[PDB]
A paper describes a structure:
Parallel to this two other proteins have emerged – primarily from genetic studies – as being factors that significantly modulate plasma triglyceride levels and CAD. These proteins, human [name] ([name]; also known as Ang5) and angiopoietin-like protein 4 ([name]) are, as the names suggest, related structurally to angiopoietins which are involved in angiogenesis via their interaction with the Tie2 (tyrosine kinase with immunoglobulin and endothelial growth factor homology domain-2) receptor. Here we determined the structures of the fibrinogen-like domains of [name] and [name], structures which offer new insights into reported loss of function mutations, the mechanisms of action of the proteins and open up the possibility of rational design of low molecular weight inhibitors. The fibrinogen-like domains of [name] and [name] form compact structures and, according to fibrinogen nomenclature, can be divided to 3 subdomains A, B and P.
There are 3 monomers of [name] in the asymmetric unit. In addition, there are two regions within the fibrinogen-like domain (Lys389 - His391 and Pro420 - Arg429 in the A-chain) for which the electron density is either missing or not of sufficient quality to allow tracing of the chain, suggesting the presence of flexible loops. In [name], it is composed of five β-strands (β3, β4, β5, β6 and β10) forming a large twisted antiparallel β-sheet, and three α-helices (α2, α3 and α4). In [name], the P subdomain contains little regular secondary structure - three short β-strands (β7, β8 and β9) and a short α-helix (α5). β7 and β8 form a small antiparallel β-hairpin, which is braced together with α5 and stabilized by a disulfide bond between Cys394 and Cys408. For example, the P subdomain of [name] contains only 1 α-helical segment and 3 β-strands and does not superimpose well with structural homologs. For [name] there are twelve reported point mutations in the fibrinogen-like domain which are associated with decreased triglyceride levels - M259T, R288Q, S292P, E375K and Y417C, Y344S and, in decreasing order of severity, G253C, I333S, D290H, C408R, Y250C and T383S (;29 S292P also reported). Potential structural defects associated with seven of the other eight mutations can similarly be elucidated using the solved crystal structure, either from potential effects on intra- or inter-molecular disulfide bond formation (G253C, Y250C, C408R) and/or disruption of structure stabilizing sidechain or backbone hydrogen bonds (Y250C, D290H, I333S, T383S) and/or disruption of regular secondary structural elements (I333S, Y344S, T383S).
Residue numbers in the entry:
A (entry chain A): 241 to 388, 392 to 419, 430 to 455
B (entry chain B): 241 to 388, 391 to 418, 430 to 454
C (entry chain C): 241 to 388, 393 to 418, 431 to 454
The structure:
Amino acid sequence: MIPAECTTIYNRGEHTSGMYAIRPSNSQVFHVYCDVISGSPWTLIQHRIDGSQNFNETWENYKYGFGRLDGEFWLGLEKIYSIVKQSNYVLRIELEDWKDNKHYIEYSFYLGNHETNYTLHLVAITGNVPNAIPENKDLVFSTWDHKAFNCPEGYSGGWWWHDECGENNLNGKYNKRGLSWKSQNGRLYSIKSTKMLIHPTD
Amino acid sequence: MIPAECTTIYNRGEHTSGMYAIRPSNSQVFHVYCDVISGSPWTLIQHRIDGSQNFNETWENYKYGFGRLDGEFWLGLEKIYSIVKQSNYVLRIELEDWKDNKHYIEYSFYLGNHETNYTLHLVAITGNVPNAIPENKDLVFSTWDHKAHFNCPEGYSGGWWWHDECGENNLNGKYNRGLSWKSQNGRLYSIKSTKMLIHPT
Amino acid sequence: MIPAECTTIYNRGEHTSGMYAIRPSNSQVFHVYCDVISGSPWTLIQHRIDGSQNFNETWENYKYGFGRLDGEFWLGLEKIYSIVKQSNYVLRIELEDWKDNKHYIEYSFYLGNHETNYTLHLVAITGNVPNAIPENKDLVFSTWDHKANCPEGYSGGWWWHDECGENNLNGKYNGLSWKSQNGRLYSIKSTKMLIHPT
């Protein structure tokens, strides 16, 4: 009776973005920000705006969530996995630079449970910004107090990593200039604000 | 049990503005922004701040809503009708110009169902700025993909209620300076932010 | 089932700050802002950002609350009492200056009902700033339209004693003044008042 996630909230007639209660299978009720983009609903799992929220958090906090749902936040790996579980989901990354240009990229992904350290497997689909995250590789999540070779760009924040590493840490240190997104070719994008958004494939 | 509208929320002791769940009679639960103005509760049905949200939406999305309840949004004609068909409602239009002067006007009104293309019938009650919307006339809603009648120049873009008289009154129009409000006998008002608000009479 | 306060919300696994419904015993449902500070949940009862909200409100609005839960607001004395009742709670005051620094101070307190004019009785516990509010004294609430006086209290609703002093966080914004008597005057840009159980 309580919707499982944002797509079913949308299909039940809530077509506006905002904060909603959901309850995925085998889970407690918790609140999410549902973000409708061009008529399609997403669950917002990460949001960064100005660096005010410290993202160099513990493993426990990256697992259960931190921040403010009306501002900068991280939903929580346990909550994200409760949504995704064994399903193929779609991940959208939205970056805005300091010149206020908007870039997006979408991936098809699978996510493992806490026993796999929430291993992420991505394949890029579309976007107007080149990919910076290794594709078709098992990416292991790590925090400052919970290391999985340690990537130089993982020194701050919780992120998914492989030996190839890279400048791709959207949960990295917000320098007070923003964040960095270095694609495979070499072009590095200065990032002022980020969103990470998911929705089921079907 | 679940409050019917923002006035119900306020009367049950919740006097802060914010996003709340409501369930109008024989309707599904949905969320609204309750806006209390000078100690008086209102249900906010549209809000425009800086023109970041595109308002040149489909008929389908004007029926069911679009946008961000904590920002720029349109509640949706089906949901507006679900609220108002319960009783009789006052419509408050609030306009902010670029000098940050607040202007307002309040109307008595009734609203038809989808079978009438949500026809609006307005009577101006009070305000501090001239009314620009034809009164005591069936105003038919139209969008870019859903035309009822004659195409008004201020209605090329957006979902709005129109009559043969047209006029510069389309608060869901293209946001440039900003939006335009002008009565037939009055001067043009350049509008930076808008609100549309309803509560029972 | 509706949780009774922000501690239950957090313990149930919602560790993000924000607006949530709650329902203390013998009370209607109402919404609060749960603020998570260093992994500990607090109920935000007062919040001021930039003076956009007018805090020279009437007694009835100070009892039932006013403002925006995601912005500047006052939760309301009746709702604050619904949470605390005759329990001994903990109060935290958060003061942010204009130079971006943050100052805090924590109190043990108990609270009286409306026929008491919501008397506040507190004593400081910790804090990186001196206290400007009289400790271990019964401070009674008053608004511009409801007296029980201090010149710092001509604007806003606040708890007062004969000591007075610039400690009115609900006072007139320009920003706000926090000064212990014969001490440094802090000009405050933003304020937070938070409570949680012991």
